[PDB]
Structure formats: structure tokens, C-alpha cells
Enzyme design. Structure first.
Site, short mmCIF file in Angstrom:
data_model
loop_
_atom_site.label_atom_id
_atom_site.label_comp_id
_atom_site.label_asym_id
_atom_site.label_seq_id
_atom_site.Cartn_x
_atom_site.Cartn_y
_atom_site.Cartn_z
N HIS A 154 6.75 28.29 101.88
CA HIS A 154 6.44 28.71 103.23
C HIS A 154 5.66 27.70 104.06
O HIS A 154 5.61 27.86 105.29
CB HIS A 154 5.65 30.03 103.23
CG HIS A 154 4.56 30.09 102.22
ND1 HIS A 154 3.24 29.84 102.53
CD2 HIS A 154 4.58 30.44 100.91
CE1 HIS A 154 2.49 30.03 101.45
NE2 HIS A 154 3.28 30.38 100.45
N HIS A 199 -3.18 23.42 105.27
CA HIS A 199 -1.74 23.53 105.46
C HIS A 199 -1.48 23.69 106.95
O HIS A 199 -2.41 23.83 107.75
CB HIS A 199 -1.16 24.72 104.69
CG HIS A 199 -1.69 26.04 105.17
ND1 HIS A 199 -2.82 26.62 104.64
CD2 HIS A 199 -1.27 26.86 106.16
CE1 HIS A 199 -3.06 27.76 105.28
NE2 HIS A 199 -2.14 27.91 106.22
N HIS A 258 1.25 25.31 110.22
CA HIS A 258 2.30 26.18 110.75
C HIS A 258 2.92 25.46 111.95
O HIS A 258 2.18 24.91 112.77
CB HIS A 258 1.73 27.56 111.16
CG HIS A 258 1.02 28.28 110.05
ND1 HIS A 258 1.67 29.11 109.17
CD2 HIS A 258 -0.28 28.27 109.66
CE1 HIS A 258 0.80 29.61 108.30
NE2 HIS A 258 -0.39 29.10 108.57
N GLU A 306 0.13 29.85 115.53
CA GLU A 306 -0.04 31.27 115.22
C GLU A 306 -0.98 31.91 116.25
O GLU A 306 -0.58 32.85 116.95
CB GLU A 306 -0.56 31.41 113.78
CG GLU A 306 0.40 30.83 112.72
CD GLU A 306 0.22 31.47 111.36
OE1 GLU A 306 -0.90 31.47 110.79
OE2 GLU A 306 1.22 31.98 110.83
N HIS A 336 -4.65 24.76 109.41
CA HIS A 336 -5.59 25.70 108.80
C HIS A 336 -6.32 25.03 107.65
O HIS A 336 -5.70 24.64 106.65
CB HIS A 336 -4.86 26.97 108.31
CG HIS A 336 -4.40 27.84 109.44
ND1 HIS A 336 -3.44 28.82 109.29
CD2 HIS A 336 -4.78 27.87 110.74
CE1 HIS A 336 -3.26 29.42 110.46
NE2 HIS A 336 -4.07 28.87 111.35
N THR A 396 -2.75 35.10 107.37
CA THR A 396 -1.54 35.25 108.19
C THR A 396 -0.25 35.22 107.39
O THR A 396 0.84 35.28 107.98
CB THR A 396 -1.47 34.16 109.26
OG1 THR A 396 -1.31 32.89 108.64
CG2 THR A 396 -2.74 34.19 110.11
N1 LIG Z 1 -4.94 25.95 94.63
C1 LIG Z 1 -5.60 27.20 94.36
N2 LIG Z 1 -6.68 27.31 93.62
C2 LIG Z 1 -7.23 28.49 93.47
N3 LIG Z 1 -6.74 29.57 93.99
C3 LIG Z 1 -5.63 29.55 94.74
C4 LIG Z 1 -5.04 28.34 94.93
N4 LIG Z 1 -4.00 28.48 95.73
C5 LIG Z 1 -3.88 29.77 95.97
N5 LIG Z 1 -4.85 30.45 95.37
C6 LIG Z 1 -4.97 31.88 95.70
C7 LIG Z 1 -5.18 31.95 97.27
O1 LIG Z 1 -5.62 31.02 97.76
N6 LIG Z 1 -4.85 33.08 98.18
C8 LIG Z 1 -5.08 32.91 99.62
C9 LIG Z 1 -3.86 32.32 100.29
C10 LIG Z 1 -3.90 32.08 101.83
C11 LIG Z 1 -3.02 32.73 102.65
C12 LIG Z 1 -3.01 32.55 103.98
C13 LIG Z 1 -3.92 31.72 104.55
S1 LIG Z 1 -3.98 31.44 106.36
N7 LIG Z 1 -2.42 31.27 106.86
O2 LIG Z 1 -4.47 32.58 106.93
O3 LIG Z 1 -4.74 30.49 106.56
C14 LIG Z 1 -4.80 31.03 103.78
C15 LIG Z 1 -4.79 31.21 102.41
ZN LIG Z 2 -2.22 29.29 107.70
#
Ligand SMILES: Nc1ncnc2c1ncn2CC(=O)NCCc1ccc(S(N)(=O)=O)cc1
Ligand SMILES: [Zn+2]
Length: 257
Positions: free
Chosen positions: A61, A91, A93, A103, A116, A195
């Protein structure tokens, strides 16, 4: 599974993740004239001098650069936050065209992309525990507009050809996220959510007023990535943004007059 297509995109997410229709969902439109200036807000403290980047990854994504968060090496403090938040990853978008991709929106304006920088509250020990807390994460959002190049982004765009498809990763050390920040740390802030699924309502959003400029060649390199894995029909990774959600009973505060 979820995605950004017609049949699995943002209007479908609530079926697997019913919080999608909750009371503090993100992103939102930032109405600059309704945001309240709050002179009790402190300046943001961005301490990135000891950041340790590790890898870059196409997760199907977006693409993300991950950091060593086993120590207080790159931390966000202050602003509206209580305590210390550790940088995990950043990352982006982005759009299929320059007039969409962000966003958050500003007075309904869409930017070409949105960066972000994702941080978690050291109170909770790990990011999996933090996502279950209302103050678990702080995400620093930065808008991208198209114009002059951002030199500090070029190291990122030049390795994207090596992570074209879902599941590819590469080592990515000594990348300095300070080269992605704009001059001003003036910001808006509001309580919100992730998001992307699971859309958990665990984020203090900190959105910078000042966009960074990137070149057309830089954003075109984003648009060559793939949603798909190698060996599946090619679907370009574009328009990986969730649109603005209802503000409901929230007020957006501004650190600036
Ligand atoms: N590398 C790592 N080490 C340890 N744990 C980790 C990891 N990778 C993922 N996890 C779990 C995690 O992070 N869940 C949250 C995911 C997330 C969604 C949307 C947004 S956003 N679009 O709102 O910013 C920002 C973050
Ligand atoms: Zn994001």
C-alpha cells in the site's frame, strides 16, 4: 483484502474495520479559518540527529523507511504532546496526477503527496501496545507540492526501482530524515486515527503548515511502484490516499496566528 481500488478501497473498509465510521477518524479537511490559535501550545521538538535508518520496504500500500526504535535516537516531544515519542518509520501517500494525493486537505486543497513520520509513545513500550491507546502515536504530516526538487529526497527515489513490487525490501542505512523537513515547524493538531487499516483511534496528528517542494521527476518515480507482487498483473501504486472524513465533535488547533 483492503486496498485502494473500486472494489476494496476506502468506501469498503468499514466492513472489516467498523471503527472507520467512528468519532475521531483521519484524515480531515483543515479549515484554516475555523482552526483555533492556541498560544498555550509549545513548539515542536524534533530531535533526529541520532536517527538510524535500517531498511526500505514496499508493503503493497505504500513504501516505508524503517528506523531503529530500540532507543531514544530520533524522538518527537513538545508541541501538544506529553512525553517522548520514538520514530518508527516514514512513508508517503500520493496521486496519479499532481492535483491529488494528499490525505489531509487545507481549505479543500489537495497536494500532490503527503509524508507521514510515524512515532510512538515510549510510555507504552512497543508500537503494538501504543496503537491500543488514545495517545499512543504521534504522526508528523508534511505536504508535498510539485516544483523545485528536494535534494534530501533523492536518495529515497533512487532506490525505488529495487523495491518495485509488493514484498520487496532493501537495506537503507544512513538516511537523514532532517532533509525532508520544511523551514517552519508551524503546525495544526487534532485527535485522530491511522489512515489505513486497522484505522485505530490512537493518533495525535501534527500537520505542518509549510509544504516541501519536490520535482516532477521525483514524484514520477513514486508512480512507477506497484501495488501488486511480482508475477501478478501490473497495477501502478498511485492514489493510495484516504479522503477526508467527518470532523464530528473535534476542534483543530493552530500553533500560529
Ligand atoms: N517495523 C515495525 N516495527 C514494529 N512494529 C511495526 C512495524 N511495522 C508495523 N508495525 C505495527 C504498526 O506499526 N501498526 C501501525 C501502522 C500504521 C498505519 C497507518 C499509519 S498513518 N497512514 O496514519 O500514518 C501509520 C502507521
Ligand atoms: Zn500515512
Amino acid at each position: 483484502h483492503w486496498g485502494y481500488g473500486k472494489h476494496n478501497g476506502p468506501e469498503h473498509w468499514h466492513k472489516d474495520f467498523p471503527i472507520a465510521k467512528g468519532e475521531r477518524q483521519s484524515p480531515v479537511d483543515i479549515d484554516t479559518h475555523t482552526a483555533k490559535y492556541d498560544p498555550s501550545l509549545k513548539p515542536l521538538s524534533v530531535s533526529y540527529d541520532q536517527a538510524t535508518s535500517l531498511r526500505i520496504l514496499n508493503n503493497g500500500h505504500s513504501f516505508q523507511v524503517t528506523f531503529d526504535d530500540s532507543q531514544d535516537k530520533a524522538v518527537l516531544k513538545g508541541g501538544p504532546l506529553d512525553g517522548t515519542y520514538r520514530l518508527l518509520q516514514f512513508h508517503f501517500h500520493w496521486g496519479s496526477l499532481d492535483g491529488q494525493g494528499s490525505e489531509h486537505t487545507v481549505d479543500k486543497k489537495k497536494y500532490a503527496a503527503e509524508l507521514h513520520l510515524v512515532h510512538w509513545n515510549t510510555k507504552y513500550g512497543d508500537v503494538g501496545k501504543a496503537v491500543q491507546q488514545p495517545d499512543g502515536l504521534a504522526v508528523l504530516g508534511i505536504f508535498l507540492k510539485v516544483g523545485s526538487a528536494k535534494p534530501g529526497l533523492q536518495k529515497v527515489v533512487d532506490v525505488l526501482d529495487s523495491i518495485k513490487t509488493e514484498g520487496k525490501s532493501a537495506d537503507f542505512t544512513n538516511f537523514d530524515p532532517r532533509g525532508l523537513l520544511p523551514e517552519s515547524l508551524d503546525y495544526w493538531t487534532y485527535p485522530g486515527s491511522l489512515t489505513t487499516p486497522p484505522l485505530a483511534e490512537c493518533v495525535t496528528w501534527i500537520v505542518l503548515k509549510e509544504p516541501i517542494s519536490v520535482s516532477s521527476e521525483q514524484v514520477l518515480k513514486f508512480r512507477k511502484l506497484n501495488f501488486n507482487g511480482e508475477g501478478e498483473p501490473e497495477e501502478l501504486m498511485v492514489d493510495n490516499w484516504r479522503p477526508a472524513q467527518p470532523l464530528k465533535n473535534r476542534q483543530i488547533k493552530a500553533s500560529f496566528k
